[PDB]
Nucleic acid binder design. Sequence first.
RNA 1: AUGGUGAACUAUGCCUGAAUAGGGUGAAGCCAGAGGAAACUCUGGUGGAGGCUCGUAGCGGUUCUGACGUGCAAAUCGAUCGUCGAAUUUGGGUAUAGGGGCGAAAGACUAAUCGAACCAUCUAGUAGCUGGUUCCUGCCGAAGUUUCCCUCAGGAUAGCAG
RNA 2: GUGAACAGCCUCUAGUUGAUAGAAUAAUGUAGAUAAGGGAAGUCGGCAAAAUAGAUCCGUAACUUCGGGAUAAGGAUUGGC
RNA 3: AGAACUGGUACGGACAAGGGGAAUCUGACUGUCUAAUUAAAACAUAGCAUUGCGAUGGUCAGAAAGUGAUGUUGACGCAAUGUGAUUUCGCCCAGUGCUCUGAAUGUCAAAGUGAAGAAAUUCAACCAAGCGCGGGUAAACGGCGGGAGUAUGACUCUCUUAAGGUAGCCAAAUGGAUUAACGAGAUUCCCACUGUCCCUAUCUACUAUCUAGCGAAACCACAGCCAAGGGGGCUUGGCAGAAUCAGCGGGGAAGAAGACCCUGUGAGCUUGACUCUAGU
RNA 4: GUGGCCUAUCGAUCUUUAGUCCCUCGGAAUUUGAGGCUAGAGGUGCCAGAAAGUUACCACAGGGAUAACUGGCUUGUG
RNA 5: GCGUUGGAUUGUUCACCCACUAAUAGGGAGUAGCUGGGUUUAGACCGUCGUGAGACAGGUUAGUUUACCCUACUGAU
Lengths: 196, 69, 24, 130, 124
Amino acid sequence: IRNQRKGAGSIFTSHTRLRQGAAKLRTLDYAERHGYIRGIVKQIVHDSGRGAPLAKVVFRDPYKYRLREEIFIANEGVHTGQFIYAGKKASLNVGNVLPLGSVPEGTIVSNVEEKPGDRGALARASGNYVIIIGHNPDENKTRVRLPSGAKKVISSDARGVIGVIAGGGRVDKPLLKAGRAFHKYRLKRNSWPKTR
Amino acid sequence: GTGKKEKSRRIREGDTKDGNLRVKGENFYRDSKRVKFLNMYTSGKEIRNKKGNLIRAASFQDSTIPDAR
Amino acid sequence: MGKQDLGKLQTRKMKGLKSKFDQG
Amino acid sequence: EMFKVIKTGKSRSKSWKRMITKHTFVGEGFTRRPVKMERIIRPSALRQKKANVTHPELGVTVFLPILAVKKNPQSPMYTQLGVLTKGTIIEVNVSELGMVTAGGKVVWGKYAQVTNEPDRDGCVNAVLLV
Amino acid sequence: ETKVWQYITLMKRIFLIDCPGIVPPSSKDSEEDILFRGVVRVEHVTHPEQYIPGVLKRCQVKHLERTYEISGWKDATEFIEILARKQGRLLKGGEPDESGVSKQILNDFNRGKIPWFVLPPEKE
RNA sequence: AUGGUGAACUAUGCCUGAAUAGGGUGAAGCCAGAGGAAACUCUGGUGGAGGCUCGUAGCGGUUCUGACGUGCAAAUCGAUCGUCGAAUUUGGGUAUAGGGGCGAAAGACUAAUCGAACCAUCUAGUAGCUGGUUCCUGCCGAAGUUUCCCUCAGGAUAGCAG
RNA sequence: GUGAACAGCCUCUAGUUGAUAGAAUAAUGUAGAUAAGGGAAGUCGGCAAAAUAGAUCCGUAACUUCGGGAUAAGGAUUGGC
RNA sequence: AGAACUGGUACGGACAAGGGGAAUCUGACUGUCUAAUUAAAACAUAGCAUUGCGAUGGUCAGAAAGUGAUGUUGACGCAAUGUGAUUUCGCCCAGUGCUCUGAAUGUCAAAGUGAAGAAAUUCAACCAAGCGCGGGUAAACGGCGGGAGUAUGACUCUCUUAAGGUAGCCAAAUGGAUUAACGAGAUUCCCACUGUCCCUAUCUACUAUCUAGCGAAACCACAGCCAAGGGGGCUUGGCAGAAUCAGCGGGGAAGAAGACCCUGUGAGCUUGACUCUAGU
RNA sequence: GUGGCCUAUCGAUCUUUAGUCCCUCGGAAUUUGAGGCUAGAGGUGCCAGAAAGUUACCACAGGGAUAACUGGCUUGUG
RNA sequence: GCGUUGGAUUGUUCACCCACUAAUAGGGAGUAGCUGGGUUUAGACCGUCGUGAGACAGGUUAGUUUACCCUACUGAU
């Protein structure tokens, strides 16, 4: 059947050519682990197959004379030319990525890590965000409310970007025809139309 | 197997003593009476051998002359 | 027989009954 | 004979049905069942209500309603079906003849035996069993 | 629409059966009475125009004046002509479509498009 | 059953290129005039969006007591038709290989073979059943009835002549 | 050129005269046509033919999701100088 | 755009090219499929609703991997489903399904433990999951006649008819799905129209026809006049004159042949049919 | 006071029992234990009786089709 | 011996009505020559059965064919 055939991944592979690239947070290193680094969002570009626009942020290499480009998930409110601060000491500003321990309880963040070093795993869809509902300093773990409504507890070392993912309200417009659905699925994967 | 076997089901129901009286396809559903009622639609056909002579006549078709005394 | 509530069964709003159209 | 195979469906190969081609009595509360349930078919045109009974005494014969069928020979399953099948004994409404037994207990019903074959005749003839 | 009976099951114990429409013959069923009922398809009638006076008699002028456009008719041939002229249901150059308009009127009357009814018996 | 071959036809994903006359209807946006405190309600203009429409190239083949039917053709021909700015048609490449692949799903395609594609071996399969069984003369010369496996089939068995 | 048009036809550059032919025009056929009066009375069935076909102007109904119906429908002209 | 003059049986003069209208059933549309008998009310569509999943997760693939698709992915996403635009949208825990408060030893495989025996071997207790007993579960698995009265609902008593003067109470304009448009979908009817017909007739190009050249195929026990009788041949009669040509489609003959059934075999599918097994 | 009493078949092929000195266990022995074997006691009580359907999606091998008197066959009078 | 007709009706059409005519009598040979209903095959839609594959008491809908061989008949050497 179709679902069983999907495992083979012959014609159901993702159309990855036009995708800009993997969206991930800055690598957790000494500079980010202890202090913070400043980056400039050069531009924001739409990613094929993804409703949330991506933001191009460039950071200088601490150990070498060169510029390292990063592809962050754009949060609503950010603008080109804005400065993004990543690290423990980063301030509570929209577009900055901070450890969950550093942000106070109740803060709304997106692209939050499940574990330190994953570079962002949760709250990646457009308009999605988590809420830090409580701090537990004893064996530091951060209690968060995921977009689905389930409550989860993760290590406070997990990082996340303040704000909400841009592109909210995308699914609020009726598609009105098969053409738009076909165009949308043209770059996602071979999963349309869905035969009964 | 094992608990869903027909023998296992009959043991669980405690009605395996009579035995031979069971009709074909005595599954969990379709009790003997139900099987007999359903099979009537498909049992209204005659049976013939290779030649074939009428081994079994159709239902209500015995084709015999009784003694009307 | 049970009771019948004729207060229900909103009569079909035929164009004839409506007074919006007149030719007097 | 008397059981005509009736075939049903677009491809007539699952007859499963039987029709009684002889006159039969079906009581007063017959009320045919759903098509899918009925196997033996007795057409209404073959259903008789009044039988002609001849009185052995007085040489008088009267047309009386049929009440019930009690004993049909030749596999009395036909008796259950109520087929006439000349040679059967059927109850008749003797009230018209005014037969009264001793003690003032007027008899309004009595047994009778059909004497004619309804298959080849459009009427039922019986001899009253006095 | 229903040419043969069919069995339908609900509640697992009662079966619904619908038979075709049956009409008992009688000399008092003159075609005018039958047509105004849903017995006969108005398509096959030879002269639908002659039945307009009957629908006029069976319905108040107010109901038609509301459902049907500009009113004030007498000699219902005039009504048919005026309705055909207003609705553009006219034959080629330029006679009004007497048959088509009358057929449509009869269809509307029989299919409940216009409001009409028969006065029940005297209250007691 | 085992060992092998197929996406040049056809089914789908993807990469890279190519192609789609002339007309009909007039959305947003915008302009001028007339009304209303305003929102706004009309009159006269620009505008060219519609998975709009008629209609060419192109794709398909709904319809004919049509053409031919050992036919040009193992699917063609004439009229007729749906569509023709997109879920459009298509060239080359690449991936999906059989109880699998694929399928906007007909049990449909998978090289004129598909409710299970093609080559070789077991394999000269299983023969219940249909068909045949090749020279001459002389002698002898049947059977269709009985018994038993609960039975049909399958049959054993008394029997008929040397 | 005609023509709204890469719509149909003629011609210009260019390319072909290639599809076995000769003698009549019987019946029946293949493809395309005409017809006195009736206009579907034929046929299971308006099956097939036929009828209006472009442009300009008057005008355009029921319904409706107000977007559409719509080329609705129903009517008058088209040549040349 | 307008005014005269003018040839008309014409005037989009050849080609060119909608027929229109009144209704019903069906599907919203656009669109796509059974290449080669079925284009559709079928498939698909946006919309609507349900279910599992927060990465040591779900759907899976793989002989297995230090393996792979979803995943360059993260609930506004993926995966699996029913319906198919807008508008419309009486009651069941009584059974059966789903999930397990609750027992606690009923069912208890392997392993482990305690006894009898010289030991194989036998017995005994305990016991995982699952199965039994036992709770909840309302848009589902399906069942029903409703209201109250009765130290508990099982049980036992009792019964149900008011409507009013051609358009309404009420409801947050409307009270419908009798839904507009769209369709090589099916059906009913009307104007035009015409050789469908009364009733047929005529014409054009090619066949058919003869000839110059080339040249098969299906089929073929042998052949080809009929009538009657026989549980094309045989018997009795009518008859019967070479060789032939053009129409011919009644029979012989074949093309056809498959249709439609009967008896022995194979396999496409399905569940508490039997034996196993991937997975868990 | 009569107009009635009850009822499924299958097992002689399953359940046992004894070897006073019955034989064998194939290298010699004893005892458990296993197999033969000859006598006895209960036997139809104890137990169940081989494992289901569709095919119009179909496939292949054989026999029949397709019809009008067995017995002159039918007709106007239940 | 010669005639025995023109037509409406399928939400049936194993019949029927009205128009003329003198009349509209009953039957056989039937006719793979053409045929519409019916046998109808892989499509598709509503109901019943069945826990299912599927078929049915229904219903609706889209879906080889001669001859130039012989005889038979009409003409012609």
